[PDB]
From a paper:
Methods enabling the production of stable recombinant trimer immunogens based on the ectodomain of Env have catalyzed recent HIV vaccine efforts. Hence, the efficient trafficking of Env trimer immunogens to follicles following immunization is likely essential to promote optimal humoral responses to HIV.
In this platform, the full-length ectodomain of Env (gp140) is genetically fused to the trimeric component of the nanoparticle and the fusion (antigen-bearing component) can be expressed and purified independently using an equivalent set of approaches applied with free soluble ectodomains. Using the approach described in the “Methods” section and Supplementary Fig. 3a, we reconstructed a 4.6 Å resolution map of the nanoparticle core and a 4.5 Å resolution map of the BG505 SOSIP trimer. A combination of Rosetta relaxed refinement and manual refinement in Coot was applied to generate the atomic models.
Numbering used by the authors:
A (entry chain F), C (entry chain B), D (entry chain D): 520 to 550, 568 to 661
B (entry chain E), E (entry chain A), F (entry chain C): 33 to 140, 152 to 185, 188 to 309, 312 to 323, 323A, 324 to 397, 410 to 506
Write the structure that this text describes.
């Protein structure tokens, strides 16, 4: 229903449309010396941003998923709201405002829990 | 009991600054090889769905912090310089000239008849050249000797006679990962939240119009004239007045010019003013008085909501500065006009056309962008120029120094070209999409 | 047996050689101001094309596979040939000619079936 | 403990820190016409190197792993040392010196074993 | 009952247009710092497996729609301009010269003795310069005064005497994701399917030879002369005739030239023709008559399969145009020759060398590519030039206007340099590999 | 029984050559718009953790094979040329001048009073210009006529008077995937393994100092003077001597210069030497004798460990060459000095300042980098220059030709600027991280 068409939707409803935004990262497929350099630099920048998202999902064990459950418990200190409000009343943009200061905490924790589990898999094999 | 769940492809974004791609309007008009904008923004548009509404999404806009104005400023200047760059230079014309008055059919002496020995295609020979000049480009050295006014300051380059700078609508498009948010709120004053928001891949087409002290050929406001300022109460800031109705201004260069040329080097061509067929008249612009009067009364009704409806609004002319600062500057028919504006601001409001004619100056050496650097020389245009432009807004400042007498004085502002582009850009914001994020769920990862 | 060495092979036989073509996408690893820009632009373009193929496989749930079965049924309207002809008599180039007008249909369907299944996995967990 | 902080650690201990190096590949996220071109070329080059590592892991069936067991047996001709020395006494830099001449052998074998197994999965389905 | 199965790494491709990378032939010959092609295509080749056969794959080729010709055109011109760009300009030579005839040992006056005051390294001084010129570069202004022929049209730049443009074989290589398909069918006429197809990473090395009305130093056809045209029956198109045998042409510049130089600015050096040791002879080229005759008879046998074997094939000379259009233009020993061709096309076929000598003109100011723009000046070469080139094909057109009399007239065609490059490029096509695709299988995804 | 296990993110690396990014030291000092280095390396530093120790890791370093020196060479030259590029050219000054001796308060005639007609802003007029010049920039043509010494060889461009080249510390940073390994071993002689190794994102800040025959303003050695050479026993190589103590050198340009200017074109400004207030003195530099003596004795103690402690170390002056080769060349206060060094190397060691003053030459046309190409003109500096620099090392060669008499002669070496940069770069190496690798494990892949 358009890129960001789900922006006003609740988080639950919006999670059902995640392929909509994923597919807009590489839209450059469809898309004067000094000028050309700046135009090219823009494409390179878009590529690095794409790759970073993929690397993070990779490290966290969510490389092939749009949605994944993890091995990091939720901290009430990040948010003490219940899931019902978060998924049914609130939208993702609002949610980002609610927890953006913990982005680096959660991400560091995700890296740690996945590293521990990958070691566990190697030891079990 | 809740666990982190990671979601990718999340419809959220952050304020962001990037470079937008420009496109012509699908090359609807080819322009052949004679238009600079069409040449640069060679990229077409596509009449695809233009917008996506974002229901229940409120976004915060600020037209004075909008980096798209900086991009237009940078791109407009850059293109203009690239366009001029390969053209024939006039270094060979920085000579001393002998001048006399032109008296032929003249009631006002605006023109001088000057002559000199100009370089020809062979290094061994010079050609005597005789032509008429406007006083604005000529300075006395001291049948006196004169020089081109800018030959002590910078190189002068002749604009290629084959290249038009006529504005075409240009659309600006987001790079992958970016989106442009458009505010459609008819009451938006340039700052704050907007609920009527939709996103676009590209802005609509905006013409890269340049002008001083009067906004030309822009869009109109709906319902009422809207006055927008970063700081309403600050007399040091320009207020942008967007009209909800256009006013036509009819401008002309009445002198039937005969253009002459000369080879001044190895395929190096120079075009000169030659002489005038018929008599001499001042360049000028006409505005219907009643229309203008109604227009200002509408502006006053709006000024009163900012300053008090018990006030007196007095209009006055430019306070001082050079032509590039105090006059209404515009390009008409390809020529550069510097018109008087004082007759337009001679009234006050206290709580068969009958037009007004504004005299204009014509100048050929252009100190473009008020930048110190190379000057452009505008080659003469054959015949007579007439054009009609749309006044779509005003740029004003207050004098200030008020003692709260309730009478305030408004004068032409101008200066920075960025303020003209803001007139359309206030509607748009650029954001970066940030698809990766997390939220709690009642779901622990299954560990195997 | 060389890049495109399988071009004249049947589709079945050619599927057994898919790593041959996959490895030629990033051959730039082995590989004057104005000229250099054009040379660089070419590398950037190759990268975007690579990434798009990977993204599509990602979205469809085939991110780690050369060959994957999906949750989109085959339409006889795209092709009413039997599998025996398709895999044993016909080559891939011929096949592309047979079904190229449905590329966008199949791909849209793949995105939809995978999105539905990913939701099912999240609800089951 | 820093990039390459594990360089003097034994291979075993160092394997527990692999996320440390993985995350330094895309550090460009945090990071005059002629000059700018050279600066841009450097970013493009870093991207191609990143992608090649990912492609190889992809082909070998280790696309989502930092550590993966494979279907290629170890050749004593590459190294006849026991695992105890390799994992507890030796560091990775030393190990690279011990087996670098077989890099292309092992990689070719990995491509072959994975291609065979992917075919087996498709035939089993 | 069948399901979509997605396959990645599928051996298929689409027609595609990209930029190929160029390489020298592994720098087998260094050329030091004196060869422009070697300098630009600094990238080496590698004698790796050169080709992959595609058994049972038929591919469609069209040599007239082959974008590699456009790339060579663009790259050849671009390099030539970059090569000339940093060299000393001859703007200081656009002066008036006094000229007299050169009569010393002359039986035909091709040369004029001209002189002028040339700029020296100090701005205060000029040097009298005396040198001989070919009439083709000199135009009367009107012991008469003359000027350089192009000083009214464009700047003239001296080619650096240190840089050779001698063609070296250049290989063109595909970017990752691309492949070049080569047709080895000995009967391929430039259009249609080819079954003898293999792929390559790179084309073989093709020399960037430039010539008019005669193809030089290209590859030969096997078995028979092959005549290729986009439109055989259209008299407005050039037919490319590829010989299966070469014919040697021996060209010379017989006048033993003494080269002189002068400093004309701050390290700015100019090289002039000086004078001639010995006597004066016309530049010329020699072709054995019998070989040429056999060559045309072979061409006729092939023309007859297109026009009827009951026909009469008449050959005739160029119909008109400038030297760049009507003569056989080539570079020999570094000098630029414009040779007569009419003696080669003076026969018709009706269903002790005994060579023919073709007189040639020598010209130093070169209107390269028949482009309007800066001219190149070719500095003189010391001594005497002799070279032998290989005639490997002809470029012909028909006059048309036929009444079906069965007699048709063939004349030299030429014009566009792209047609010479097509002579090798007809064998190659560029495609893009498209590894991602689908097919039905009896396999539903297992859903867990 | 073991299987291949693939590990990604492995902490290993290979020797590698890449381009490092440069950064100013967080723009601690703005420099406004007057510093070239600050302008180019606009990128800031960040005082983050600077290093990571690599315990138990031994790395092999070789300062003479270190490609960072090549990068500095390339970047320093490139920036210098970009900086000079947009400045006003002095082509108009390549004229003949009449000169007489300057005799006013002169005891030694170093200066000449020369004059000529210089181009003014109009093409029709010249201005008589009178100014004083150093003999080093002036050559006789033959009250004799003289010219600028380089007007026969290359264009001369005036350095912009607004741009300083004063070295600022510049840090070099690794691209993603790269790391810089730093050796902290106090005894490292430039080649071989180092156990005291840590890695950094960036090198510390190194000033891009240029000098001949003496290293200035670099870091000091700890504990002892360290002599480093690729080939100690080869008399053809430079030995770099790093001091563990600095020696100050006080240099001056004592003549109180009055700077004059002229407009020579359309905003084209030229700055000339004018005249001198007061009397005339030679430029010179002062070094305390005892400090210098101690410094050489320390150098001798170290030379003896390479050549024998039963030796005699004799020092001698430059053997021959131009000023750029034989003198101590440096920039002081923005001016270019070429100082005598012979008084510093007049001693031998056999197993109230009392300073030495070294006379210096001042030259304004600079043959920068000893490259054939455009020359730079250094505009005059108003007033008097005094500066003090730090001698941090010496560059020496041996004469060789030894008969094993045990007496060896050491003379100033110099030449290549790369050797100065090596003085700091010897501590750093660039490597590429190679995260993908394998090892055997007792683990077969589980096959499903
Ligand atoms: C605000 O918007 C108005 C228009 O809405 C702009 O004014 C227009 O400016 C253009 C450009 O100067 C004017 O067009 C000119 O018309 C001349 C002749 O007009 C007749 O012939 C044309 C041919 O198609 C008809 O369309 C037209 O109706 C008339 O029949 C042309 O000769 C001019 O061509 C010039 O450029 C070409 C380029 O190759 C040259 O070859 C020509 O020799 C010549 O130089 C040009 O086409 C248009 O008429 C103007 N409108 C009005 C009402 O006058 C304002 O300029 C704009 N204001 C701002 C600030 O942007
Ligand atoms: C080795 O390192 C030493 C320093 O450790 C370097 O020598 C220094 O060089 C700088 C640059 O020439 C000298 O600084 C100059 O000082 C002049 C006046 O000094 C007084 O005023 C300043 C104002 O802040 C005070 O800091 C200072 O203490 C004094 O009070 C200035 O006039 C000079 O400015 C010049 O550039 C600006 C740029 O816009 C112009 O506007 C000015 O007109 C002028 O051109 C400059 O600041 C410094 O004094 C020197 N030190 C010593 C001890 O003399 C060596 O050069 C360096 N050697 C090498 C090889 O790198
Ligand atoms: C904007 O808010 C309105 C409500 O304020 C949303 O309306 C809901 O629409 C769903 C659709 O099925 C209904 O089930 C809800 O009952 C509606 N809400 C109410 C209060 O009636 C609307 O959908 C929101 N917009 C977006 C984009 O989600
Ligand atoms: C080209 O076509 C021929 C047949 O027309 C193919 O030949 C087949 O080769 C396989 C190899 O084992 C045999 O089993 C088949 O029986 C052969 N076919 C026939 C009809 O005998 C040949 O392989 C094809 N080329 C390619 C590249 O596949
Ligand atoms: C460098 O080598 C020393 C030993 O030579 C390592 O010391 C070991 O540290 C671990 C830490 O728990 C101890 O368990 C070992 O017993 C220590 N070894 C000995 C012989 O006592 C040191 O860790 C090594 N450095 C690195 C980076 O691994
Ligand atoms: C034109 O006439 C006015 C009258 O005073 C005079 O001031 C002016 O200088 C004259 N211009 C020329 C070029 O003679
Ligand atoms: C050319 O220069 C001469 C000076 O000798 C001057 O008299 C003449 O008027 C000049 N030509 C023109 C058109 O001014
Ligand atoms: C695609 O549509 C065109 C339309 O005429 C048709 O000719 C062509 O065969 C179609 N291709 C496929 C694969 O259906
Ligand atoms: C690689 O081969 C060279 C050949 O002499 C050998 O010296 C080196 O030790 C070998 N390295 C390995 C890891 O086998
Ligand atoms: C050379 O002689 C011919 C003879 O008619 C004459 O036409 C020509 O102009 C002469 N050229 C010169 C430079 O005198
Ligand atoms: C230089 O110019 C003078 C004109 O005063 C002319 O007589 C002389 O012939 C010229 N020199 C040459 C070589 O033509
Ligand atoms: C200055 O005087 C010396 C004394 O011999 C003389 O050689 C030199 O040429 C003189 N220079 C000038 C410019 O007169
Ligand atoms: C300018 O040129 C004249 C030559 O006619 C010469 O006498 C005069 O001295 C020159 N001016 C200077 C300052 O040398």
């Amino acid at each position: 229903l358009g890129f960001l068409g789900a922006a006003g939707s609740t988080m639950g409803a919006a999670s059902m449309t995640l392929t909509v935004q994923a597919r807009n990262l590489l839209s450059g497929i469809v898309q004067d010396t000094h000028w050309g350099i700046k135009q090219l630099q823009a494409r390179v920048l878009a590529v690095e941003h794409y790759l970073r998202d993929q690397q993070l999902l990779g490290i966290w064990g969510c490389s092939g998923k749009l949605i994944c459950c993890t091995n990091v418990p939720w901290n009430s200190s990040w948010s003490n709201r219940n899931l019902s409000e978060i998924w049914d009343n609130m939208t993702w943009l609002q949610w980002d405002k609610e927890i953006s200061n913990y982005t680096q905490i959660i991400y560091g924790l995700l890296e740690e829990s996945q590293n521990q589990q990958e070691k566990n898999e190697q030891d079990l094999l | 009991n809740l666990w982190v769940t990671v979601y990718y492809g999340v419809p959220v974004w952050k304020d962001a600054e990037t470079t937008l791609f420009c496109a012509s309007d699908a090359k609807a008009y080819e322009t052949k090889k004679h238009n600079v904008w069409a040449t640069h923004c060679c990229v077409p548009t596509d009449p695809n769905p233009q917008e996506i509404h974002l229901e229940n999404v409120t976004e915060e806009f600020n037209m004075w912090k909008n980096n798209m104005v900086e991009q237009m400023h940078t791109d407009i200047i850059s293109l203009w310089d690239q366009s001029l760059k390969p053209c024939v230079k006039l270094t060979p014309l920085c000579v001393t000239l002998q001048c006399t008055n032109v008296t032929n059919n003249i009631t006002d002496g605006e023109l001088k008849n000057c002559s000199f020995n100009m370089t020809t295609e062979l290094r061994d020979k010079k050609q005597k050249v005789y032509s008429l000049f406007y006083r604005l480009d000529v300075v006395q050295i001291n049948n006196k000797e004169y020089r081109l006014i800018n030959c002590n300051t910078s190189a002068i380059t002749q604009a290629c006679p084959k290249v038009s700078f006529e504005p075409i609508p240009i659309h600006y498009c987001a790079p992958a990962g970016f989106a442009i948010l458009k505010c459609k709120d008819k009451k938006f004053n340039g700052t704050g939240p907007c609920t009527n928001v939709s996103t676009v891949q590209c802005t609509h087409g905006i013409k890269p119009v340049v002008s001083t002290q009067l906004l030309l050929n822009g869009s109109l406001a709906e319902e009422e004239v809207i006055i927008r300022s970063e700081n309403i109460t600050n007399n040091a800031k320009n207020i942008l007045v967007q009209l909800n109705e256009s006013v036509q201004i009819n401008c002309t260069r009445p002198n039937n010019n005969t253009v002459k040329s000369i080879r001044i080097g190895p395929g190096q061509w120079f075009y000169y003013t030659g002489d005038i067929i018929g008599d001499i008249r001042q360049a000028h612009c006409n505005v219907s008085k009643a229309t203008w009067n109604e227009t200002l009364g509408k502006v006053v009704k709006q000024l009163r909501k900012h300053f008090g409806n018990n006030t007196i609004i007095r209009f006055a002319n430019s306070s001082g500065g050079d032509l590039e600062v105090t006059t209404h500057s515009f390009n008409c028919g390809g020529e550069f006009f510097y018109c008087n504006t004082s007759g337009l601001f001679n009234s006050t409001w206290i709580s068969s056309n009958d037009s007004i004619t504004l005299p204009c100056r014509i100048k050929q050496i252009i100190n473009m962008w008020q930048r110190i650097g190379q000057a452009m020389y505008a080659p003469p245009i054959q015949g007579v120029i007439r054009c009609v432009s749309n006044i779509t807004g005003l740029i004003l400042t207050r004098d200030g120094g008020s003692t709260n007498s309730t009478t305030e004085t408004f004068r032409p502002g101008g200066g920075d070209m960025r303020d003209n582009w803001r007139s359309e850009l206030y509607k748009y914001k650029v954001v970066k999409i940030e698809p990766l994020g997390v939220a709690p769920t009642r779901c622990k990862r299954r560990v195997v």
